[PDB]
From a paper:
The mammalian TRPC subfamily consists of seven transmembrane proteins (TRPC1-7) that have been proposed to form non-selective cation channels in various cell types. TRPC6 and its most close homologs TRPC3 and TRPC7 are unique among the TRPCs in that they can be directly activated by second messenger diacylglycerol (DAG), a product of phospholipase C action. TRPC6-mediated cation influx regulates physiological function of pulmonary endothelial cells, smooth muscle cells and glomerular podocytes, whereas TRPC6 hyperactivity has been implicated in maladaptive tissue and organ remodeling. In this study, we present two high-resolution cryo-EM structures of antagonist- and agonist-bound human TRPC6 in lipidic nanodiscs.
Detergent-solubilized TRPC6 (Δ2–72) was first purified to homogeneity in the presence of the antagonist AM-1473, and then exchanged into lipidic nanodiscs composed of the membrane scaffold protein, MSP2N2, and soybean lipids. The structure of the antagonist-bound TRPC6 in nanodiscs was determined at a resolution of 3.1 Å using single-particle cryo-EM. Based on the shape and chemical environment, it is very likely that the density within the pocket of S1-S4 observed in the final postprocessed map and two corresponding half-maps belongs to the antagonist AM-1473, which consists of an aminopiperidine, a benzonitrile, and an indane. The antagonist engages in both hydrophilic and hydrophobic interactions with residues from S1-S4, the TRP helix and the membrane-reentrant loop following the TRP helix. The primary amine moiety off the piperidine ring forms hydrogen-bond interactions with Glu509 on S2, and Asp530 on S3. The benzonitrile group is involved in a cation-π interaction with Arg758 on the reentrant loop as well as aromatic-stacking interactions with His446 on S1 and Tyr753 on the TRP helix. The indene double ring makes van der Waal contacts with Tyr612 on S4. Overall, the three ring groups in the antagonist knit the intracellular ends of S1-S4, the TRP helix and the reentrant loop together. Mutation R758A, which disrupts the cation-π interaction, lowered the binding affinity by ~300 fold. We found that the AM-1473-bound TRPC6 and the BTDM-bound TRPC6 assume a nearly identical conformation (Cα-RMSD 0.588), with S1-S4 and the S4-S5 linker in the slightly up conformation, distinct from the slightly down conformation in agonist-bound structure.
Numbering used by the authors:
A (entry chain A): 733 to 767, 853 to 920
B (entry chain A): 85 to 194, 203 to 433
C (entry chain B): 85 to 134
D (entry chain D): 853 to 882
E (entry chain D): 335 to 383
F (entry chain B): 883 to 920
The structure:
């Protein structure tokens, strides 16, 4: 048993004891009984719940399958940048050769 | 000399290149082979049975995915959508949902082999729609995107219902029927769906926790799962009461719509939701400090003095009412509505 | 058929681009749309209100 | 037959779910 | 991992077409007695069993 | 804290690809404007 539910069970029993005296009824004891705004508030609370739930989801420990995504990001970036560099060098060399064939 | 081979053949030398380029992110090689190769099959599979779309979605390659989705010959697009929803890739989901098979929100809710991934079987169970999977994995943005296209989770029928589809399912397979019922309830009982799908999520969560606690006793198997679903339906309400900062927010969580509810009995709030949280046995909603601070103000109603007193003074006033009990009985008998009545 | 919508409208096709560029780091698109677009509202919000 | 088909799909589910469970361990320093 | 009942009957019981029918209109419990003899407790204490 | 690294790589990718395209476009324009004189 968790040590935090021992307070919750007692406070639920105490509130169940309280709720039996809230009812309008038996006031004299045992020898003497013989004689709009709501939509706005709910919208802001749902927005707080969604933002706080995303904050709590971004507090879990990172596992092995979220670093592989970063690794594939770096791999795709490497392939794209190296091809762009080779394509730029090839286009510059071709456009310089096609004007060096005129001198 | 047996092996598990999911294709039981050999790949071409111009298809292993395409699969390696799709898996490891080689975007220019995919651009070159997807335009300058007419003898290429874009639906070739690797040793496990995954084609280029299911290898680019599983590795978060958005550019290769947007490059392959313009082909109009791809297979396994619904499985790629389910895999991207499962892994949580929001840009890949928003790029797959623009393919012309989800045009008017056609396949997003509730036979067709659209979500197959192997030509024998599906990746998740056959009941699982994109909205149920997006609500299982707690993806708030994907749930909002799929709710914006008109996709809901259909509430299951009663356990003793006899419709002419509820009996055909139980005659075909009574295992997958119970598994489908519990997957639909697991999708319905999640905070990502409870907070975004309804107008008053506290009332919906209380009724759903009562319904799951009833089905935990009616349906004797799967009891330890319906208990967990009801427990998380209660945890939603307890974590929603915790965020309140004013007293109007406390009175809007503990009590319902104040302007469209009765005033009560005395100058005290309407305790109709807060009796339902005792009947439905939501213990942490009633044992929360923001609820005790409201209940103590009704308990200590006309007593500002005895509220702040210490112990061994209330024992003395118990003995004082023990001594003078018929006098206070006469006070309540003859003269009520007074400073003592 | 209720939804939690924090703006309860539809974004423009030239404002979803600005919000995607601001969120995902596209600095040249932000430089271009922040100088060569005079009909742009820089205070447009997404589905959550940011 | 049917038994080989069912065992093949269950072995494929086991391999995919085992790789998913392997990609849920906490990331270490190496 | 089993989702249908044919997959449950293929894990708990062997090849159905190449095994005897049993005693009554009930499946062949030959693997499921071997899981009791070999003392595999969580295979027999599983809900699908 | 890993999402911050992911957004760092994303912003770096966008900035580098635009710089490469801008450099190639400027070189092609300044070579065309001198190849229109031969």
């Amino acid at each position: 048993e968790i040590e935090d539910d021992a307070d919750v069970e007692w406070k639920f029993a105490r509130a169940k004891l309280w709720f039996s005296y809230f009812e309008e009824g038996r006031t004299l004891p045992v020898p003497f009984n013989l004689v709009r705004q709501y939509q706005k508030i709910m919208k802001r609370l749902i927005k707080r719940y969604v933002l706080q739930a995303q904050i709590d989801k971004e507090s879990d420990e990172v596992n092995e399958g979220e670093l592989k995504e970063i690794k594939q990001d770096i791999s795709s970036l490497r392939y794209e940048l190296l091809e762009e560099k080779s394509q730029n060098t090839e286009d510059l060399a071709e456009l310089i050769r096609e004007l060096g064939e005129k001198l | 000399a047996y092996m598990f081979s999911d294709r039981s053949t050999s790949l071409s030398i111009e298809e292993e290149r395409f699969l390696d380029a799709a898996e490891y992110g080689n975007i220019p090689v995919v651009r070159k082979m997807l335009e300058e190769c007419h003898s290429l099959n874009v639906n070739c599979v690797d040793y496990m049975g995954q084609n280029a779309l299911q290898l680019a979605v599983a590795n978060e390659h958005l550019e290769i995915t947007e490059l392959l989705l313009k082909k109009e010959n791809l297979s396994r697009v619904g499985d790629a959508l389910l895999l991207a929803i499962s892994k949580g890739y929001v840009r890949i989901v928003e790029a797959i949902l623009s393919h012309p098979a989800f045009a008017e929100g056609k396949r997003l809710a509730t036979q067709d082999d659209f979500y197959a991934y192997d030509e024998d079987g599906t990746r998740f169970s056959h009941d699982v729609t994109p909205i149920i999977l997006a609500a299982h994995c707690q993806e708030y943005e994907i749930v909002h995107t799929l709710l914006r296209k008109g996709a809901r989770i259909e509430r299951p029928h009663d356990y003793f219902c006899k419709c002419n589809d509820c009996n055909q399912k139980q005659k075909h397979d009574s295992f997958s029927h119970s598994r489908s019922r519990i997957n639909a309830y697991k999708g319905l009982a999640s905070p990502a769906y409870l907070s975004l799908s309804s107008e008053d999520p506290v009332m919906t969560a209380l009724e759903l926790s009562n319904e799951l606690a009833v089905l935990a006793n009616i349906e004797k198997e799967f009891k330890n799962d319906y208990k967990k679903l009801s427990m998380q339906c209660k945890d939603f309400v307890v974590g929603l009461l915790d965020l309140c900062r004013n007293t109007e927010e406390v009175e809007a969580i503990l009590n319902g719509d104040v302007e469209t509810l009765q005033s009560g009995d005395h100058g005290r709030p309407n305790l109709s939701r807060l009796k339902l949280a005792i009947k439905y046995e939501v213990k942490k909603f009633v044992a929360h400090p923001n609820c005790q601070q409201q209940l103590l103000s009704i308990w200590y109603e006309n007593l500002s003095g005895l509220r702040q007193q210490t112990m061994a003074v209330k024992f003395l006033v118990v003995l004082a009412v023990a001594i003078g009990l018929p006098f206070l009985a006469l006070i309540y008998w003859f003269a009520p509505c007074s400073k003592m009545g």
